[PDB]
Scaffold this motif. Structure first.
Motif, PDB file in Angstrom:
ATOM      1  N   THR A   1       0.975  -1.295   0.162  1.00  0.00           N
ATOM      2  CA  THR A   1       0.231  -0.173   0.020  1.00  0.00           C
ATOM      3  C   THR A   1       0.868   1.257   0.045  1.00  0.00           C
ATOM      4  N   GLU A   2       2.023   1.177   0.723  1.00  0.00           N
ATOM      5  CA  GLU A   2       2.765   2.358   0.831  1.00  0.00           C
ATOM      6  C   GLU A   2       3.743   2.351  -0.584  1.00  0.00           C
ATOM      7  N   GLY A   3       3.777   1.296  -1.224  1.00  0.00           N
ATOM      8  CA  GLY A   3       4.474   1.460  -2.489  1.00  0.00           C
ATOM      9  C   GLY A   3       5.937   1.059  -2.203  1.00  0.00           C
ATOM     10  N   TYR A   4       6.142   0.070  -1.669  1.00  0.00           N
ATOM     11  CA  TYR A   4       7.108  -0.941  -1.106  1.00  0.00           C
ATOM     12  C   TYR A   4       7.163  -2.207  -1.912  1.00  0.00           C
ATOM     13  N   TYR A   5       8.578  -2.527  -2.110  1.00  0.00           N
ATOM     14  CA  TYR A   5       8.276  -4.048  -2.634  1.00  0.00           C
ATOM     15  C   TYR A   5       8.212  -5.058  -1.842  1.00  0.00           C
TER      16      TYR A   5
ATOM     17  N   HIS B   1       5.569 -10.351   2.460  1.00  0.00           N
ATOM     18  CA  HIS B   1       7.100 -10.142   2.574  1.00  0.00           C
ATOM     19  C   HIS B   1       7.534  -8.839   2.292  1.00  0.00           C
ATOM     20  N   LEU B   2       8.191  -8.233   2.980  1.00  0.00           N
ATOM     21  CA  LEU B   2       8.627  -6.905   2.885  1.00  0.00           C
ATOM     22  C   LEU B   2      10.204  -6.802   2.515  1.00  0.00           C
ATOM     23  N   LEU B   3      10.379  -6.401   1.168  1.00  0.00           N
ATOM     24  CA  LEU B   3      11.463  -6.391   0.937  1.00  0.00           C
ATOM     25  C   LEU B   3      12.648  -5.355   1.099  1.00  0.00           C
ATOM     26  N   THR B   4      12.248  -4.127   1.173  1.00  0.00           N
ATOM     27  CA  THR B   4      12.662  -3.086   1.530  1.00  0.00           C
ATOM     28  C   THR B   4      12.118  -1.639   1.449  1.00  0.00           C
TER      29      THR B   4
ATOM     30  N   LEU C   1      16.320   1.333  -4.148  1.00  0.00           N
ATOM     31  CA  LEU C   1      16.133   0.336  -4.884  1.00  0.00           C
ATOM     32  C   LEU C   1      14.825   0.213  -5.678  1.00  0.00           C
ATOM     33  N   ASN C   2      15.161  -0.238  -6.833  1.00  0.00           N
ATOM     34  CA  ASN C   2      14.014  -0.502  -7.771  1.00  0.00           C
ATOM     35  C   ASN C   2      13.527  -1.835  -7.654  1.00  0.00           C
ATOM     36  N   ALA C   3      12.436  -2.176  -8.247  1.00  0.00           N
ATOM     37  CA  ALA C   3      11.896  -3.614  -8.167  1.00  0.00           C
ATOM     38  C   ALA C   3      13.028  -4.639  -8.399  1.00  0.00           C
ATOM     39  N   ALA C   4      13.817  -4.261  -9.433  1.00  0.00           N
ATOM     40  CA  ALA C   4      14.844  -5.356  -9.860  1.00  0.00           C
ATOM     41  C   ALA C   4      15.883  -5.660  -9.096  1.00  0.00           C
ATOM     42  N   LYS C   5      16.489  -4.442  -8.453  1.00  0.00           N
ATOM     43  CA  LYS C   5      17.592  -4.373  -7.358  1.00  0.00           C
ATOM     44  C   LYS C   5      17.167  -5.087  -6.042  1.00  0.00           C
ATOM     45  N   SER C   6      15.849  -4.754  -5.883  1.00  0.00           N
ATOM     46  CA  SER C   6      15.245  -5.433  -4.560  1.00  0.00           C
ATOM     47  C   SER C   6      15.407  -6.806  -4.770  1.00  0.00           C
TER      48      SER C   6
END
Length: 164
Positions: free
Chosen positions: A21-25, A31-34, A39-44
């Protein structure tokens, strides 16, 4: 019902990196990525590949999904129980209401929850109706009010009716 069931409901399942919802990966069951802007989606997915232990190209499987899910649910418990102001209500709470509490921590974490000053009193005081009000008075309720409802109802009645 029980925690995993609740979360599996609230968080849903998704095998491919998406944005919370936050615009977080996020990948899998919440599961929260970062949260870094770097980072972008790919780097995450690097971060992922680490936790997963293999290149995933930002895709996991139901199992890895479930794998981290567990690690996630622990950690919140872990949370609750480390915190000087969480552990009290947790202890104060019953097996179902705990599933409420934990849910929150799995959504915003240790810190962000403990910040629910008055409620945590109110709900340790075992003051349901009030407590459930004060909570609806939040950014939280504001961001995801749906999810916030079910839980709030949860802390209110004491069951899983909200989870139907």
């Amino acid at each position: 019902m029980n925690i995993f069931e609740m979360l599996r409901i609230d968080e849903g399942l998704r095998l491919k990196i998406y944005k919370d919802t936050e615009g977080y990966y996020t990948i899998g069951i919440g599961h929260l990525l970062t949260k870094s802007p770097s980072l972008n989606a790919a780097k995450s997915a690097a971060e992922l590949d680490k936790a997963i232990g293999r290149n995933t190209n930002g895709v996991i499987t139901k199992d890895e999904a479930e794998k981290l899910f567990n690690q996630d649910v622990d950690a919140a418990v872990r949370g609750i129980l480390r915190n000087a102001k969480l552990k009290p209500v947790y202890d104060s709470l019953d097996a179902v209401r705990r599933a409420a509490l934990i849910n929150m921590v799995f959504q915003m974490g240790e810190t962000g929850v403990a910040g629910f000053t008055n409620s945590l009193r109110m709900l340790q005081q075992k003051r349901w109706d009030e407590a459930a009000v004060n909570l609806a008075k939040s950014r939280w309720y504001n961001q995801t009010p749906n999810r916030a409802k079910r839980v709030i109802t949860t802390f209110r009645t004491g069951t899983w009716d909200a989870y139907k």
